Structures are given as structure tokens and as C-alpha cells.
Amino acid sequence: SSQIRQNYSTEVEAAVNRLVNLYLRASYTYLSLGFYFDRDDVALEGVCHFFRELAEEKREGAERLLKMQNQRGGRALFQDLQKPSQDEWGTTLDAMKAAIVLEKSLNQALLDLHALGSAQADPHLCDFLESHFLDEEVKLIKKMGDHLTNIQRLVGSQAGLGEYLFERLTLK
Amino acid sequence: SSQIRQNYSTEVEAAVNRLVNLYLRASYTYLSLGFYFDRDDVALEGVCHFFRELAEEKREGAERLLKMQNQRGGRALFQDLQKPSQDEWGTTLDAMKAAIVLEKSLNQALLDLHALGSAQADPHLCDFLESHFLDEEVKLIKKMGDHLTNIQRLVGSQAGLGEYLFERLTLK
Amino acid sequence: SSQIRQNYSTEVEAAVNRLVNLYLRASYTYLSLGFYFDRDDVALEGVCHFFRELAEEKREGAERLLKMQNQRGGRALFQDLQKPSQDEWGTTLDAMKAAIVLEKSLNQALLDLHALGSAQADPHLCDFLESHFLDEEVKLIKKMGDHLTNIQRLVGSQAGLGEYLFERLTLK
Ligand SMILES: [Au+]
Ligand SMILES: [Au+]
Ligand SMILES: [Au+]
Ligand SMILES: [Cl-]
Ligand SMILES: [Cl-]
Ligand SMILES: [Cl-]
Ligand SMILES: [Cl-]
Ligand SMILES: [Cl-]
Ligand SMILES: [Cl-]
Ligand SMILES: [Cl-]
Ligand SMILES: [Cl-]
Ligand SMILES: [Cl-]
């Protein structure tokens, strides 16, 4: 094992590699969502921007996990990335529903890794997650929930109108 | 339950609402302490200012708890606020003793909520308390203990003299 | 006990005093390492500077522990400081190996104190260590491990050459 490794279980090391794969899969999903909203037959620029910014945040989360794996003396191991679950993402409402389902799965994976760290008595790992991940996911999920309420109140009987207005007046 | 709620127990949700009530009660107590020291027959401006600033800090603590309740998908519920325990607060020594008793009760309520979060495996809640509340209460209680030692060493056999000097030279 | 003390076990108080002694011993060891590399017959200025800066960081860690002991209402108690384990420290490789052994002992003492805090349900203590100590030790141990790999790849069959180059091009 590493010259530096101390109090770092093989179970946590493997779970960190699987979480890197989830975050990179989530980034890839957001890349697909963003380019879908840039299609000329979809054409919602603020929705495109919202998802492209999330693609960058999820890749940054993966790279912070990989930095920490090396700082603890674990060994990064990469696996195939599965393509996103859809090729076309429907309305902004459909896309925001898929986004909050994706973020709740990331949050559950973070909470499961925290529970493993707590069982392994690994307080650096618990610190790391509580400082860089758990509050970021709660805030993002709250933000998506607010958006989903506003998109839903705009459907009325003029769904196209509501979709334009949300993009223009909430997402710029 | 919320579209956003995840890993957030009904027990924690209720305990957060009760802690909001404690913090708003503490704010109300500090408002009363501050206006008492502004009476013309008490007239200790630095003591007034010390307690009025604490009234604001305790209201800010309540509003940060309420923000977090909504970020987790819980439901704020407000109850009646009881009036403070006294209408007149005696000397600066009496008032500082009542203040440290009040802050030790807030600290115990924070530690009890942390213990509930730890039993519910709610690391976002534990993070939140450890980042925004626990060190603020330890520092404030230390600061009050320092003040109580200085007020006590000033009583001597010239209590009025000591009360003036403490207000002038420690609390500006 | 203190007017301020709350949820602060005698076991944690004593363990904090022992950790202060370890940190001051580590500072003293780094003072010795730094002055050894300033000898005219050793003369590695970047190595001197590296260890003198660690002597200051370990003394600062002791003083932050002592500040927290007083903020919790415990009582600082100082013991004799043992001299460092060596009077002469060999090559930069020998010195960096002794440094990472010393930092791994500090890290284990921090993890043991965190485990005691967790058993005593002392979340302020756990917070304190996770915020000011645990990530600083992981980062430093990683940094020393990187240095040890670079020093080792420079030994070749020209050890003096490698020792000069490391000092000049990594440690300025
Ligand atoms: Au942990
Ligand atoms: Au927890
Ligand atoms: Au703890
Ligand atoms: Cl544009
Ligand atoms: Cl697939
Ligand atoms: Cl407008
Ligand atoms: Cl004035
Ligand atoms: Cl009442
Ligand atoms: Cl003066
Ligand atoms: Cl020089
Ligand atoms: Cl000795
Ligand atoms: Cl050069």
C-alpha cells in the first residue's frame, strides 16, 4: 500500500472510484441535456445554459474526488461511462424532473459513502463530504424543486407560453 | 412529503421548529435586557449595546434554521413566544449571569439536536450545526465567562464604581 | 469545574494536554532538523527552510489546541518536552523519512482524539479537529510522500548531485 496511506479502508477506496463514475455519468447526462435545448427545434437558451453549467459542476466534483483519492493514497480506477438514459429530453418540465431524479441518486450515493466512512471511523472522509458535497446537493435539489414548482404553475392551458416565459424570466 | 425531501426525519423537522422557538425566545430576552440598560435610572450604554447585538444574533440564528428547514423540505411551524423571565434585570452582574444561563440552554438544545441527527444518520444536519452554531456558542459562552470574572473582580466594596468602569473600559 | 464548561469530559481535557505536548515535541524536532541543514558541512538552504516552516506550523497547532482548551473550560497543563530523537539527521532522504514518520504519529494521535470525542458525544471537539487539523495532516503527508518519491528517483549512482538538484529545483 502507499507510503502515505493511513486509516483509509479498501472499502472506501472502491466506493470513491464508483462515485467518480457516477459523477462523470451525471456530467455526461447534463452535456446531453444542454445540447438538446440548443437544437433549432427546441431553442431554449437559458435551459441549455442551466444544464451545461451543471455538466461542469459534476465534472469538478469528480476531479475533487480523484484529488482526494490520491491525497489518501488510494488508486484511481476508471470504468466505462454509460451513455445518458435518453437521447431526447422532452419539455423543460420533463428535463427538470429527470435532473432532480439524477441529483437525488447522487445525494443518496454521498450519504451511503458518508455512512461507510462513519462505520470505518474515517473522519477525514466524512469531513471531506460534509465540506464539499452534502450542502452543495441540498442547495441544488432545493433550487430544482423551486424551478419545478414555477414550471408547473406556468403550464396552465398555454404550455408553450409558459415554457418561453420561464426560460426568459427565470433562467435569463 | 416534499419533492425534495431526502434523509430528513420527522423527528429532526420537529426539533428544528422547537429550536427556532428557543432562539426567538432568546432574542426577545435580549431585547428586554437591552432596553432595561437604556432606562434613565440604569443608564449603562455599553451594556445596552452588548445585549441588543445579541438580540440580533439570536434572531439571525432562528432565520438560518428556518432557511435550512425549507432547504431540506420540512415545514416551518411557529408557536407562541413566551415573554422573558424577568421585567427588570438588576445589576450588570445579575444580567450577565442570566445571559450565560440562557446561552448554556441554547448550547444544550444544539447538542441534543446534533445527537438526534447522529442517531437519524443525518450528516447534513450535523454539518449545519457544527459549521454555523456550535463554535459560535462556545465562543460566546467563553466571552461571557471572561466578562463575569472581570465584573466580579470590580465589585470590591465600591460596586457602583466597578459597574461604571466595566461598562466604560470593557464594553465601550 | 469552569462556569463555562459544558459537555467537555475530563478524558478529552487530558488527551488535549497530551496532544499539545506532541505538537511542541514535533516543533522542537523540526527546529533541530532545520538547524542541521544550515550547518556549513550540510548546507542545504531549501531543506533548512522546509523544516523551519514546519517548526512554526507545529507550534501554531499547539497554540490552537491551548486556545480551544481554554474556550471549553479545561485547564492547560504542561509537561517536560523531550529532546528530538537524533542530534544529526543524515541526508535529505533520511530527514524526509523521519519527518513522515513523525507526521503519521501526529495524525494517529488526532484520529485517536477524534474517536474519543465521538465516544464522549463531543461534536465541538470533532468539528475542531476536522476543521483545523485532519485535512492539514493529510495534505502535508501527501506533500512529503511526493518529495520522498522525487528524492529517491534522484539518488541514481550520483547521490550528491541528486541531493543538490532536489534542493535547488523543488525546495528553491
Ligand atoms: Au466519520
Ligand atoms: Au450526523
Ligand atoms: Au463527535
Ligand atoms: Cl444568445
Ligand atoms: Cl447504458
Ligand atoms: Cl423583463
Ligand atoms: Cl451615546
Ligand atoms: Cl411565560
Ligand atoms: Cl481610557
Ligand atoms: Cl540565501
Ligand atoms: Cl528523550
Ligand atoms: Cl532553473
Author numbering:
A (entry chain AAA), B (entry chain AAA), C (entry chain AAA): 1 to 171, 175
Would you copy out the relevant sentences from the publication that reported this structure?
Auranofin (AF), a gold(I) compound that is currently used for the treatment of rheumatoid arthritis and is in clinical trials for its promising anticancer activity, was encapsulated within the human H-chain and the horse spleen ferritin nanocages using the alkaline disassembly/reassembly protocol. Mammalian Fts are composed of two different chains, the H-chain (heavy) and the L-chain (light), that assemble to form a hollow cage-like structure with an internal diameter of 8 nm and an external one of 12 nm. In fact, in both AFhsFt and AFhHFt structures, the gold atoms are found close to the side chains of cysteine residues.
At variance with what was observed for AFhHFt, the structure of AFhsFt presented a single gold binding site. In the structure of AFhsFt, a gold atom is bound to Cys126, buried at the interface between two hsFt subunits. ICP-AES data indicated that about 270 gold atoms were encapsulated within AFhsFt, achieving a protein chain to metallodrug molar ratio of ~1:11, while only about 90 atoms of gold were found in the nanocage based on the human H-chain Ft, with a protein chain to metallodrug molar ratio of ~1:4. This suggests that AFhsFt has a high number of AF molecules that can be released from its bulk and that it preserves the features of the native protein and thus its ability to be recognized by the Scara5 receptor. On the contrary, AFhsFt preserved almost the same cytotoxicity of AF on the cancer cell line, but its selectivity was also decreased when compared to free AF.
